[PDB]
């Protein structure tokens, strides 16, 4: 399939209350597999998916040291950013980082990512060529010039083409039962009278992985887009996801309405009715 690995770092300063809090999480596709939190009692990278658990102590120890060093580096970055933007030393600010690789079915790198936001706005990003930067403003151009002079892109590129892809492929193999085989939604339509003349039909998709899915109501085979309430896809808490779509219909006309579900785990798109 096409697969991705990504790390998401968040550092948040709190001047007067000590060093910034640093949290990292790692994902393969829609599956979180590791976390680190600098405010934990004795901070360490921890597993959050069963298939990563087989990695030996050297793995966890090296990653733990990496995160502790990254929290220090982000603290310095946050101080620099405060200066670049001439901001007060009293306020809290946020530095977020996200990086990783996408690979195809053959395992080859399709795209590498390495980018940063300050206070929830794009700051600097490594371009698709993995060789040049896009800076958001004159502050980010300071970072850009520093990184260009120090040949940063080439070292980022080395990680994204080498270790990122090699470790992603490993995780896919070790976790193949959970990562390579989509889990289709369990589906049902429920019916809720509003009054003697209107009722709600709600089409449910539960327990599916990965999160990508499409739910649509049709009336006599035509899409009812303008009239459908659709909720954001949401996590069930067990690594699977949920979504529903609802339409309000005249009482007695329910039989005209069908719910269509598309998901990678289905043998074919489903057509559901109130039944």
């Amino acid at each position: 399939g096409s697969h991705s690995m990504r790390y998401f770092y968040t550092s948040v300063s709190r001047p007067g209350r000590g060093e910034p809090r640093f949290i990292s999480v790692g994902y393969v596709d829609d599956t979180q597999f590791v976390r680190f939190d600098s405010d934990a009692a004795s901070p360490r990278e921890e597993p959050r998916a069963p298939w990563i658990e087989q990695e030996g102590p050297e793995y966890w120890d090296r990653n733990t040291q990496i995160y502790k060093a990254q929290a220090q580096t982000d603290r310095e970055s946050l101080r620099n950013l405060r200066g670049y933007y001439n901001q007060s030393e009293a306020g809290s600010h946020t530095l977020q980082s996200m990086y990783g690789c996408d690979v195809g079915p053959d395992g080859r790198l399709l795209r590498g990512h390495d980018q940063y936001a300050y206070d929830g706005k794009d700051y600097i990003a490594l371009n698709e060529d993995l060789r040049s930067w896009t800076a958001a403003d004159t502050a980010a151009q300071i970072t850009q010039r520093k990184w260009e002079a120090a040949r940063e892109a080439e070292q980022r590129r080395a990680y994204l083409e080498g270790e990122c892809v090699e470790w992603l492929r490993r995780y896919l193999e070790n976790g193949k039962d959970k990562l390579e085989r989509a889990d289709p939604p369990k589906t049902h339509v429920t019916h809720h009278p509003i009054s003697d003349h209107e009722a709600t039909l709600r089409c449910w998709a539960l327990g599916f992985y990965p999160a990508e899915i499409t739910l649509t109501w049709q009336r006599d085979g035509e899409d009812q887009t303008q009239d459908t309430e659709l909720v954001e896809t949401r996590p069930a808490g067990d690594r699977t996801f949920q979504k529903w779509a609802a339409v309000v219909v005249p009482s007695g006309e329910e039989q005209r309405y069908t719910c269509h579900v598309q998901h990678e785990g289905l043998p074919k798109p489903l057509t559901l009715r109130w039944e």
Binding site: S77, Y99, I124
Partner: peptide, 11 residues
């Protein structure tokens, strides 16, 4: 597995 420093230096 995450990326290490050096490379990935301060902003």
């Amino acid at each position: 597995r995450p990326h290490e420093r050096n490379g990935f230096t301060v902003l």
